[PDB]
Design an enzyme around this catalytic site. Structure first.
Site, short mmCIF file in Angstrom:
data_model
loop_
_atom_site.label_atom_id
_atom_site.label_comp_id
_atom_site.label_asym_id
_atom_site.label_seq_id
_atom_site.Cartn_x
_atom_site.Cartn_y
_atom_site.Cartn_z
CD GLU A 1 -6.28 -8.26 7.30
OE1 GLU A 1 -6.92 -7.71 6.51
OE2 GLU A 1 -5.43 -7.71 7.66
CG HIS B 1 -1.98 -1.00 1.40
ND1 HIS B 1 -3.25 -1.09 1.19
CD2 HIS B 1 -1.74 -2.46 1.73
CE1 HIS B 1 -3.74 -1.94 1.29
NE2 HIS B 1 -2.86 -2.92 1.72
N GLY C 1 -9.57 -2.33 3.63
CA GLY C 1 -10.31 -1.85 4.79
C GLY C 1 -11.04 -2.52 5.90
#
Ligand code: DCF
Ligand code: DCF
Ligand code: NA
Ligand code: ZN
Ligand code: ZN
EC number: 3.5.4.4
Lengths: 334, 334
Positions: free
Chosen positions: B200, B14, B170
């Site tokens: 996750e 990221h 997110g």
């Protein structure tokens, strides 16, 4: 939150566990030390805790690259000077900087007495240039055995006019405190104060031994006292200091979570516990973060955090005149 | 260890979670953004994981200060440019940089299409100046809801000639993948590839949804597949990529320890799993450390680490011609 109208102390702060990564890179290049990485961001995980280590000794390895680049005595003076600047920028009014000259000297075989002299010079120049108050604590690194600790003690005592106390740090489980009784007799006969890392990796019996046989009036960490109600009673009524290091205890896996850290219960027991950094650069923290983030996560109210800040002043290895003066100086602020 | 004669990829990285602390300080001063601290060492614990966070969103909060200082489009261009330099310094040959332009834009209300164009410009200048290969992946930040993600997708697709894929990232449990089916229909209709953060914080059901309903051919993390033997067979049979982020999964508390991370079992099941950084600045790591320290601690042999390195080449959103050329370029080194 830090209280502006109170002195802010850091009483448990290893200057040789607080070496800037940029300084590691520059000294590493200056002395031709092959580091595992060559930029700030790529070197960071090798010199800073990534996630909690499974033990105290696993955590201690993270300090190794910082002292591996101490190629001459000027390097030790530099790290000491930079540590005073870092303490200033961490809002500290009075810092006790502890250091193991044997540990600092061993990678490049520096003269251990020379290292003590260089650290004294560097902190003195830093105090002159940055304007905070500071005292020095010499560490015997128990990890390297009693003979090395005697050599280290001899070097420390040769500058006893500039050092206020002697500490015992390193591998607590591997080198218990009963091996250093005669070392600390020499410390007390020289008139120096005594703090001891105890009850971190080992149990309450290590804290009792430090108090009774080493003459410690402050204990680094001491978190295992939470299992010994009589010890907690003793700490409160004899006003033994507890140098609490919240993030450090997480990162050594000494405490599983801040929510269960004993600091709040120590304060509720009337124990003189104070808030400290330990090895700020290795941990990736600094003192204001311990006050603003870690201590609330440990469940402390603002009132308890203020009590802990005051405890740091009361525990400092300073005279009552000097403690009065620090309180009166800070009271003008805020 | 990295294998020198093989291309080194980072496919899950990221750029807006990799903003240099020095850059945060400088842009914060430029735009008057009041930061919680004002030096590198004191700001570090506010912008970087100290120990494992209790949840995914607690980890994600560490990114906030980096995007809070993006005061104009040129700031976005700068952090995109600096990201290419960081990937170069991390020994990466081919990076896929992902970014959420809506998240980057929201603190100072920048035009989201403007942010996309600025990021393209900055990576393009970095690829020219630093000489590695890179592609971009536009992120829909599920956290801010389906309308925000639609606006974000519109901005991403306006530059689809310079972007290879769209991602969903997110708060996974708070905004499940089943809310974004129409978004990813547009992604596929535009001809872009699909990767999805799934498995996750939520279960393997989330990974199934990404594969079957969003059309994902790679999954970010996917660590919960280890509980679903049918899903593991499917991943291996259909060559679905698993983008593994060892340190990241520890620091979100998604995985209890590196030794229990599923990467090794994925590789032993024949799954195309690869090694990635995720948010290197926030985590305090970089890619060589993941290869050299984290992956051995996760139990991988050097043979498995090499297979994971090859898997990253095979999973890249590149043509077979471009993959052959990367292999051929690396093969002359070592
Ligand atoms: O100042 C350097 C010396 O101190 C030790 N040391 C440094 N930080 C700590 C140490 N010891 C014990 N407990 C963990 C933490 O408080 C390492 C070295 O011997
Ligand atoms: O690129 C920034 C966007 O990505 C999210 N994001 C950043 N890192 C991660 C994210 N999301 C999910 N899982 C954890 C980790 O892989 C935050 C923001 O929405
Ligand atoms: Na950190
Ligand atoms: Zn210590
Ligand atoms: Zn991610």
């Amino acid at each position: 939150m830090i209280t502006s109208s109170l002195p802010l102390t850091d009483l448990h702060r290893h200057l040789d566990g607080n070496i800037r990564t940029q300084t590691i890179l520059e000294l590493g290049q200056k002395f031709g030390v092959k580091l595992p990485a060559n930029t700030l961001q790529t070197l960071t995980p090798y010199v800073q805790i990534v996630e909690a280590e499974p033990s105290l000794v696993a955590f201690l390895s993270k300090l190794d690259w910082g002292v591996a680049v101490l190629g001459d005595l000027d390097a030790c003076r530099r790290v000491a000077y930079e540590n005073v600047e870092d303490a200033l920028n961490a809002r500290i009014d009075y810092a006790e900087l502890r250091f193991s000259p044997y540990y600092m000297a061993m990678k490049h075989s520096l003269p251990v007495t020379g290292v003590v002299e260089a650290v004294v010079d560097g902190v003195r120049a830093g105090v002159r240039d940055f304007g905070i108050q500071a005292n020095l604590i010499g560490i015997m690194s128990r990890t390297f055995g009693t003979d090395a600790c005697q050599q280290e003690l001899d070097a420390i005592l040769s500058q006893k006019n500039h050092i206020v106390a002697v500490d015992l740090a390193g591998d607590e489980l591997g080198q218990p405190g009963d091996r250093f009784i005669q070392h600390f007799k020499q410390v007390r006969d020289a008139g120096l104060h005594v703090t001891v890392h105890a009850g971190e990796a080992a149990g309450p019996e290590s804290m009792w031994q430090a108090i009774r046989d080493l003459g410690a009036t402050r204990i680094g960490h001491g978190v295992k006292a939470i299992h010994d109600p009589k010890l907690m009673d003793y700490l409160a009524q004899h006003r033994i200091g507890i140098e609490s290091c919240l993030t450090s205890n997480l990162q050594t896996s000494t405490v599983d979570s801040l929510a269960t850290h004993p600091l709040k219960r120590f304060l509720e027991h009337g124990i003189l516990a104070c808030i400290n950094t330990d090895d700020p650069a290795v941990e990736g923290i600094e003192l204001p973060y311990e006050y603003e983030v870690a201590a609330p996560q440990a469940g402390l109210s603002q009132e308890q955090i203020r009590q802990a800040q005051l405890n740091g002043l009361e525990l400092a290895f300073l005279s009552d005149s000097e403690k009065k003066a620090l309180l009166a100086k800070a009271a003008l602020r805020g």
